[PDB]
Short mmCIF file of C-alpha atoms and ligand atoms in Angstrom, two decimals:
data_model
loop_
_atom_site.label_atom_id
_atom_site.label_comp_id
_atom_site.label_asym_id
_atom_site.label_seq_id
_atom_site.Cartn_x
_atom_site.Cartn_y
_atom_site.Cartn_z
CA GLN A 17 72.50 96.65 123.38
CA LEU A 18 69.72 98.97 124.58
CA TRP A 19 69.36 100.83 121.26
CA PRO A 20 67.88 100.08 118.88
CA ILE A 21 65.23 97.60 120.20
CA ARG A 22 65.61 94.19 118.63
CA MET A 23 62.30 92.77 117.43
CA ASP A 24 63.44 90.06 115.05
CA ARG A 25 61.06 87.12 114.85
CA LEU A 26 59.06 88.74 117.64
CA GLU A 27 56.04 89.94 115.53
CA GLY A 28 52.55 89.38 116.86
CA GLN A 29 53.86 89.21 120.48
CA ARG A 30 51.88 90.91 123.28
CA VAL A 31 52.12 91.24 127.06
CA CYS A 32 49.64 92.82 129.52
CA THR A 33 50.61 93.93 132.99
CA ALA A 34 49.44 96.45 135.53
CA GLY A 35 51.76 98.95 133.99
CA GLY A 36 50.07 98.77 130.60
CA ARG A 37 50.13 96.93 127.31
CA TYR A 38 53.19 95.85 125.41
CA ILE A 39 52.74 94.94 121.72
CA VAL A 40 55.28 93.98 119.05
CA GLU A 41 53.36 95.01 115.84
CA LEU A 42 56.09 94.16 113.38
CA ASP A 43 59.79 93.14 113.33
CA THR A 44 60.40 96.86 112.85
CA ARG A 45 57.75 98.20 115.21
CA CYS A 46 56.71 97.64 118.85
CA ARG A 47 54.37 99.58 121.09
CA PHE A 48 53.89 100.50 124.78
CA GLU A 49 50.42 101.75 125.76
CA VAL A 50 51.24 102.92 129.27
CA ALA A 51 48.56 102.48 131.86
CA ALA A 52 48.47 105.37 134.33
CA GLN A 53 46.90 105.75 137.82
CA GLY A 54 43.17 105.43 137.26
CA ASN A 55 43.74 102.86 134.48
CA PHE A 56 43.52 105.57 131.73
CA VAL A 57 46.11 105.78 128.97
CA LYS A 58 48.06 109.00 129.13
CA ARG A 59 51.09 107.95 127.09
CA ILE A 60 51.74 105.68 124.13
CA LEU A 61 55.30 104.86 122.94
CA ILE A 62 55.88 103.77 119.38
CA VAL A 63 59.31 102.40 118.54
CA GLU A 64 60.16 101.96 114.85
CA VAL A 65 63.40 100.83 113.31
CA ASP A 66 64.49 101.52 109.75
CA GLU A 67 67.49 99.28 109.19
CA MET A 68 69.94 100.86 111.69
CA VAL A 69 68.17 104.07 112.60
CA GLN A 70 65.45 104.05 115.24
CA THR A 71 62.69 106.48 115.85
CA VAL A 72 60.69 106.73 119.07
CA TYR A 73 57.34 108.38 118.98
CA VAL A 74 55.94 109.48 122.33
CA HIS A 75 52.18 110.16 122.15
CA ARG A 76 50.49 112.20 124.87
CA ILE A 77 46.78 111.56 125.50
CA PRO A 78 44.55 113.77 127.61
CA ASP A 79 43.27 112.10 130.81
CA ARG A 80 39.91 110.26 130.89
CA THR A 81 39.94 109.78 127.03
CA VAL A 82 41.03 106.19 126.59
CA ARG A 83 41.13 103.21 129.11
CA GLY A 84 43.87 100.67 129.40
CA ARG A 85 43.01 97.85 127.03
CA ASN A 86 43.54 94.09 127.32
CA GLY A 87 45.63 91.99 125.01
CA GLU A 88 43.84 90.95 121.78
CA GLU A 89 41.88 94.23 121.78
CA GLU A 90 42.29 96.79 119.02
CA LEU A 91 45.28 99.21 119.08
CA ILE A 92 44.47 102.63 120.66
CA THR A 93 44.24 105.44 118.03
CA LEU A 94 47.42 107.49 118.00
CA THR A 95 47.65 111.30 118.26
CA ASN A 96 48.74 113.58 115.39
CA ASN A 97 51.34 115.52 117.37
CA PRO A 98 53.71 113.02 119.09
CA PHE A 99 57.13 113.90 120.37
CA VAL A 100 59.80 112.47 118.08
CA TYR A 101 63.26 111.12 119.14
CA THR A 102 65.90 109.79 116.75
CA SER A 103 68.43 108.84 119.37
CA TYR A 104 68.51 107.80 123.04
CA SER A 105 70.01 110.77 124.80
CA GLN A 106 67.50 113.10 123.11
CA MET A 107 64.87 111.44 125.23
CA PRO A 108 64.19 112.97 128.62
CA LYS A 109 64.75 110.69 131.63
CA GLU A 110 61.06 110.40 132.41
CA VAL A 111 60.42 109.15 128.88
CA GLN A 112 63.59 107.09 129.01
CA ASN A 113 62.14 105.12 131.96
CA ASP A 114 59.11 104.10 129.96
CA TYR A 115 61.41 103.16 127.08
CA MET A 116 63.38 100.84 129.39
CA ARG A 117 60.19 99.10 130.39
CA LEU A 118 59.35 98.39 126.81
CA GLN A 119 62.72 97.19 125.62
CA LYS A 120 63.07 95.13 128.75
CA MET A 121 59.73 93.42 128.15
CA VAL A 122 60.82 92.75 124.56
CA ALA A 123 64.43 91.74 125.06
CA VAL A 124 63.93 89.78 128.32
CA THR A 125 60.36 88.56 128.87
CA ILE A 126 59.07 88.21 125.36
CA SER A 127 62.39 87.05 123.93
CA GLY A 128 62.55 84.51 126.70
CA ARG A 129 59.30 82.84 125.48
CA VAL A 130 60.41 82.49 121.91
CA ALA A 131 62.48 79.50 120.80
CA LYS A 132 65.14 80.28 118.22
CA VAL A 133 67.01 77.09 117.83
CA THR A 134 65.77 73.64 119.13
CA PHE A 135 68.03 70.60 119.09
CA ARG A 136 66.42 67.17 119.28
CA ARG A 137 68.21 64.36 121.16
CA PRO A 138 71.65 65.92 121.71
CA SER A 139 74.53 63.54 122.43
CA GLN A 140 74.16 65.34 125.81
CA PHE A 141 70.57 64.33 126.25
CA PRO A 142 69.30 61.99 123.50
CA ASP A 143 65.95 61.67 125.36
CA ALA A 144 64.75 65.35 125.16
CA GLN A 145 65.01 68.56 123.19
CA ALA A 146 67.15 71.56 124.01
CA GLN A 147 65.84 75.06 123.21
CA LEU A 148 67.92 78.24 122.90
CA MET A 149 65.49 81.15 123.29
CA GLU A 150 65.68 84.58 121.59
CA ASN A 151 67.20 86.16 124.76
CA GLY A 152 69.90 83.51 124.93
CA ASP A 153 68.22 81.48 127.71
CA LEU A 154 68.53 77.69 127.43
CA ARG A 155 65.46 75.59 128.10
CA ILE A 156 65.76 71.78 128.17
CA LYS A 157 62.30 70.16 128.11
CA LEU A 158 62.28 66.91 130.08
CA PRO A 159 59.31 64.72 130.97
CA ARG A 160 57.39 66.96 133.43
CA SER A 161 60.39 69.23 134.17
CA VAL A 162 62.45 72.02 132.47
CA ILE A 163 66.16 72.64 132.99
CA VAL A 164 66.67 76.34 132.71
CA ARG A 165 69.88 78.27 132.12
CA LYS A 166 69.41 81.96 132.37
CA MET A 167 71.57 84.01 129.98
CA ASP A 168 71.73 87.14 132.16
CA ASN A 169 73.30 85.84 135.34
CA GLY A 170 74.27 82.34 134.19
CA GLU A 171 72.05 80.77 136.82
CA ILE A 172 70.81 77.16 136.56
CA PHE A 173 67.73 75.68 138.05
CA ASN A 174 65.11 72.88 137.25
CA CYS A 175 61.45 73.86 137.33
CA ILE A 176 57.98 72.41 137.96
CA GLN A 182 58.80 80.19 141.25
CA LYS A 183 60.72 76.90 140.98
CA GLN A 184 64.22 75.65 141.81
CA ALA A 185 66.49 74.07 141.92
CA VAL A 186 69.03 71.36 141.93
CA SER A 187 72.55 70.99 140.37
CA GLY A 188 75.31 68.44 140.72
CA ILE A 189 75.77 66.15 137.73
CA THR A 190 73.30 67.60 135.37
CA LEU A 191 74.60 71.08 135.85
CA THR A 192 77.90 70.07 134.19
CA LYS A 193 75.92 68.63 131.30
CA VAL A 194 74.00 71.80 130.51
CA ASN A 195 77.08 73.80 129.59
CA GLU A 196 78.21 71.90 126.47
CA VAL A 197 74.75 71.84 124.93
CA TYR A 198 74.51 75.55 125.86
CA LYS A 199 77.98 75.96 124.30
CA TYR A 200 77.02 73.74 121.37
CA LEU A 201 73.85 75.70 120.74
CA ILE A 202 75.60 79.07 121.28
CA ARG A 203 78.30 77.76 119.09
CA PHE A 204 75.54 76.56 116.67
CA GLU A 205 73.81 80.00 116.74
CA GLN A 206 76.87 82.25 116.55
CA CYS A 207 78.12 80.08 113.81
CA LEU A 208 74.75 80.16 112.11
CA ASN A 209 74.95 83.89 112.69
CA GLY A 210 77.63 83.72 110.05
CA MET A 211 74.83 82.82 107.61
CA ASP A 212 74.47 85.02 104.52
CA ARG A 213 71.77 87.71 104.55
CA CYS A 217 66.79 80.25 108.60
CA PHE A 218 65.63 81.13 112.08
CA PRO A 219 63.88 79.66 113.87
CA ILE A 220 65.36 76.17 113.29
CA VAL A 221 64.64 72.68 114.57
CA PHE A 222 67.39 70.03 113.93
CA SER A 223 68.96 66.70 114.85
CA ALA A 224 72.64 65.90 114.61
CA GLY A 225 74.79 62.92 115.14
CA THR A 226 73.23 59.51 115.52
CA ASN A 227 71.36 57.80 114.33
CA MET A 228 70.23 60.05 113.16
CA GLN B 17 92.24 67.67 96.56
CA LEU B 18 93.47 64.11 95.74
CA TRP B 19 95.68 63.80 98.88
CA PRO B 20 94.89 62.90 101.53
CA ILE B 21 91.81 60.84 100.69
CA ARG B 22 88.79 62.15 102.64
CA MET B 23 86.94 59.45 104.52
CA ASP B 24 84.82 61.42 107.02
CA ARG B 25 81.53 59.74 107.82
CA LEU B 26 82.36 57.03 105.29
CA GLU B 27 83.16 54.19 107.58
CA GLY B 28 81.61 50.87 106.54
CA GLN B 29 81.06 51.84 102.97
CA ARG B 30 82.01 49.15 100.43
CA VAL B 31 81.92 48.87 96.68
CA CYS B 32 82.44 45.74 94.52
CA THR B 33 83.22 46.12 90.80
CA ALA B 34 85.09 44.25 88.13
CA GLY B 35 88.23 46.05 89.07
CA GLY B 36 88.27 44.79 92.62
CA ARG B 37 86.88 45.53 96.07
CA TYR B 38 86.81 49.04 97.64
CA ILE B 39 86.39 49.22 101.43
CA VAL B 40 86.41 52.17 103.86
CA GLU B 41 87.51 50.43 107.06
CA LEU B 42 87.53 53.57 109.21
CA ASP B 43 87.26 57.32 108.80
CA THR B 44 91.03 57.25 108.77
CA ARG B 45 91.53 54.09 106.67
CA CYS B 46 90.28 52.79 103.33
CA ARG B 47 91.21 49.76 101.18
CA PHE B 48 91.47 48.63 97.59
CA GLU B 49 91.80 44.90 97.00
CA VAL B 50 92.81 45.04 93.26
CA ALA B 51 91.44 42.19 91.10
CA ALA B 52 94.06 40.90 88.61
CA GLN B 53 93.93 39.05 85.33
CA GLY B 54 92.52 35.61 86.26
CA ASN B 55 90.20 37.09 88.89
CA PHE B 56 93.02 36.72 91.50
CA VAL B 57 94.12 39.44 93.96
CA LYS B 58 97.68 40.57 93.10
CA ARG B 59 97.61 43.94 94.83
CA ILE B 60 96.13 45.51 98.01
CA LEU B 61 96.32 49.21 98.68
CA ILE B 62 96.00 50.53 102.20
CA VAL B 63 95.48 54.28 102.70
CA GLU B 64 95.75 55.58 106.18
CA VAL B 65 95.43 59.19 107.41
CA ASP B 66 96.77 60.49 110.78
CA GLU B 67 95.09 63.93 111.11
CA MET B 68 96.72 65.37 107.96
CA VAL B 69 99.49 63.04 107.08
CA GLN B 70 98.72 60.07 104.90
CA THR B 71 100.52 56.82 104.45
CA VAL B 72 99.84 54.50 101.47
CA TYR B 73 100.74 50.86 101.88
CA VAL B 74 100.97 48.86 98.62
CA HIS B 75 100.91 45.15 99.27
CA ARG B 76 102.04 42.73 96.52
CA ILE B 77 100.33 39.30 96.63
CA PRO B 78 101.84 36.43 94.47
CA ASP B 79 99.64 35.63 91.49
CA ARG B 80 97.00 32.91 91.78
CA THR B 81 96.98 32.49 95.57
CA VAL B 82 94.02 34.55 96.62
CA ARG B 83 90.68 35.24 94.81
CA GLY B 84 88.71 38.49 94.68
CA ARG B 85 86.19 38.31 97.52
CA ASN B 86 82.62 39.58 97.52
CA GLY B 87 81.06 42.13 99.79
CA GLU B 88 80.96 41.92 103.61
CA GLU B 89 83.47 38.97 103.41
CA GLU B 90 86.57 38.97 105.65
CA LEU B 91 89.31 41.41 104.84
CA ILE B 92 92.13 39.69 103.02
CA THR B 93 95.12 39.23 105.28
CA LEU B 94 97.89 41.63 104.45
CA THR B 95 101.59 40.95 103.68
CA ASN B 96 104.45 41.81 105.99
CA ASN B 97 106.45 43.75 103.41
CA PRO B 98 104.34 46.41 101.67
CA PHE B 99 105.83 49.32 99.75
CA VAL B 100 105.34 52.45 101.85
CA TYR B 101 104.58 55.94 100.48
CA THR B 102 104.26 59.12 102.51
CA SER B 103 103.55 61.39 99.60
CA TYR B 104 101.82 61.25 96.21
CA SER B 105 104.78 61.89 94.03
CA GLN B 106 106.72 59.03 95.66
CA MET B 107 104.27 56.61 94.11
CA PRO B 108 105.11 55.17 90.67
CA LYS B 109 102.58 55.76 87.86
CA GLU B 110 101.23 52.17 87.95
CA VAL B 111 100.59 52.56 91.73
CA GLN B 112 99.30 56.08 91.17
CA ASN B 113 96.68 54.76 88.78
CA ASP B 114 95.45 52.26 91.31
CA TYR B 115 95.45 55.03 93.85
CA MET B 116 93.31 57.34 91.65
CA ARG B 117 90.75 54.52 91.20
CA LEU B 118 90.42 54.25 94.94
CA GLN B 119 90.16 58.02 95.72
CA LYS B 120 87.60 58.41 92.92
CA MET B 121 85.48 55.59 94.22
CA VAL B 122 85.56 57.12 97.70
CA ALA B 123 85.21 60.80 96.91
CA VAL B 124 82.75 60.45 93.92
CA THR B 125 80.71 57.19 94.01
CA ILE B 126 80.59 56.39 97.72
CA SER B 127 80.35 60.14 98.86
CA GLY B 128 77.45 60.49 96.42
CA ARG B 129 75.40 57.92 98.31
CA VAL B 130 75.91 59.46 101.74
CA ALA B 131 73.65 62.24 102.90
CA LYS B 132 75.45 64.94 104.82
CA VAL B 133 72.83 67.69 105.18
CA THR B 134 69.08 67.09 104.68
CA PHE B 135 66.61 70.01 104.73
CA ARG B 136 62.92 69.33 105.18
CA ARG B 137 60.39 71.58 103.44
CA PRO B 138 62.60 74.48 102.17
CA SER B 139 60.59 77.56 101.14
CA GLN B 140 61.59 76.70 97.58
CA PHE B 141 60.03 73.23 97.95
CA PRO B 142 57.91 73.12 101.07
CA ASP B 143 56.64 69.66 99.99
CA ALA B 144 59.88 67.66 99.96
CA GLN B 145 63.27 67.23 101.55
CA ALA B 146 66.60 68.36 99.97
CA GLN B 147 69.74 66.30 100.66
CA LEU B 148 73.36 67.63 100.26
CA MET B 149 75.50 64.60 99.79
CA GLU B 150 79.21 64.17 100.87
CA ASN B 151 80.54 64.82 97.32
CA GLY B 152 78.62 68.04 97.14
CA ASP B 153 75.80 66.59 94.94
CA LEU B 154 72.31 67.80 95.66
CA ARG B 155 69.49 65.26 95.77
CA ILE B 156 65.93 66.48 96.13
CA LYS B 157 63.52 63.62 96.91
CA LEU B 158 60.13 64.27 95.34
CA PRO B 159 57.12 62.00 95.07
CA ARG B 160 58.17 59.33 92.62
CA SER B 161 61.13 61.39 91.34
CA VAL B 162 64.55 62.76 92.37
CA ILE B 163 65.99 66.15 91.34
CA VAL B 164 69.72 65.60 90.88
CA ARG B 165 72.46 68.27 90.72
CA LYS B 166 75.88 66.93 90.09
CA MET B 167 78.64 68.93 91.84
CA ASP B 168 81.34 68.21 89.27
CA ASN B 169 79.72 69.56 86.05
CA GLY B 170 76.72 71.42 87.38
CA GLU B 171 74.36 69.23 85.44
CA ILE B 172 70.67 69.08 86.42
CA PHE B 173 68.24 66.19 85.77
CA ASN B 174 65.34 64.31 87.17
CA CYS B 175 65.47 60.62 88.16
CA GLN B 182 66.62 54.61 83.10
CA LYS B 183 68.20 58.05 83.29
CA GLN B 184 66.09 60.77 81.80
CA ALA B 185 66.34 64.54 82.21
CA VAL B 186 64.11 67.58 82.61
CA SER B 187 64.50 71.31 83.46
CA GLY B 188 63.19 74.56 82.23
CA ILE B 189 60.91 75.67 85.07
CA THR B 190 62.12 74.03 88.26
CA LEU B 191 65.78 74.38 87.27
CA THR B 192 65.62 77.94 88.71
CA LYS B 193 64.31 76.46 91.98
CA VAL B 194 67.23 74.05 92.56
CA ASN B 195 70.21 76.46 92.62
CA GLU B 196 69.29 78.70 95.59
CA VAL B 197 68.49 75.75 97.85
CA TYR B 198 71.86 74.38 96.71
CA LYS B 199 73.26 77.76 97.55
CA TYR B 200 71.24 77.73 100.78
CA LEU B 201 72.59 74.30 101.73
CA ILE B 202 76.12 75.01 100.54
CA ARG B 203 76.09 78.26 102.42
CA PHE B 204 74.53 76.22 105.24
CA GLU B 205 77.32 73.65 104.99
CA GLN B 206 80.11 76.21 104.57
CA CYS B 207 78.66 78.26 107.37
CA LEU B 208 78.48 75.12 109.50
CA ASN B 209 82.07 74.49 108.54
CA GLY B 210 83.01 77.22 110.98
CA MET B 211 81.82 74.94 113.75
CA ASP B 212 84.26 74.30 116.51
CA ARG B 213 86.38 71.17 116.47
CA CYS B 217 77.35 67.83 114.09
CA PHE B 218 77.33 66.10 110.63
CA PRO B 219 75.22 64.48 109.44
CA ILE B 220 72.30 66.81 110.17
CA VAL B 221 68.52 66.93 109.51
CA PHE B 222 66.69 70.24 109.99
CA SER B 223 63.63 72.40 109.35
CA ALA B 224 63.86 76.16 109.20
CA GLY B 225 61.81 79.41 108.96
CA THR B 226 58.06 79.64 109.02
CA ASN B 227 56.13 76.53 108.09
CA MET B 228 56.59 74.99 111.51
MG1 MG C 1 62.23 62.60 116.69
MG1 MG C 2 57.81 67.30 109.25
MG1 MG C 3 60.01 65.91 103.76
#
């Protein structure tokens, strides 16, 4: 789902690219300080979620007023007259593009770095730990190598971009992936936890 | 539920009392070598479960031929003509009594010693580990003391015996709820235990 943006367990998280700065301020608020041509900030997107309703604040900054900032630097001061959007289609396409860049950075890149469930010594690999990331990706930490299963396209490759391999181990990744997805979706039936580290089976 | 007897994760568990020897041979088979007057074995119950069907074999051993054996000793050889029961009501009351003694020993005493879910550093006690036992009992291992919540009567006590409460009694029930909801939630697992875990934000 593209709306609202999911920021659960993603607080404190930042990313800096050539396109600007992406900051998840709270589990209910993230930010996109868009860097423009000439490295000045002309637009700041604020995305805030109250339970199930989401508000997107689009601040417009006059040119040559504020420069694109690096990661741990202070948040740029916001304007007092931002455009306000309460639903996706209300946003114009030119603003919608900047919104896509932010939610992608949060749901794909950032969520891919954050471990949600980690399983130590599965019966599938009693010699390592299997990590299911926030974006659904599976990461199996081996000595000096990582077996990666991408949630988006189902691809499988071993790493040090990297690649690749397959054969016998590729069959092995799917049950632990299924186990953990089964563990997560089942643990998604938890009452209104994550992140979790566990061991199961033997011995033990 | 008294039938069938639940023996999951209880293989290997044995108990020796004055009433006889109680042995869980497999997760689908348990055993009660009943001690008789004169410390001889006159009756052996075998309880076996195939998925959901349970068969109870009641062996009758002639008096004064075989003595009650101690723990980890060889299983007494069975007879070739045991009474066979496929349901609870089929059993006569004297066999039913011996059956109750076995299922109690397995579901209460033995199950109370086996940890099923253990949670390290819950937010309610980030300094200990909480264990949910097979019989539903909660055991919280503290430094030099154990907080016990009995599943049957809801009683709460520390550690001889001895009992406490007041402040701290409030702390035990949510973790119990947390773990029971964790257990019952993990009961929706596909066709795991036992499990040790840490959760949240101390890690
Ligand atoms: Mg370990
Ligand atoms: Mg620890
Ligand atoms: Mg501990």
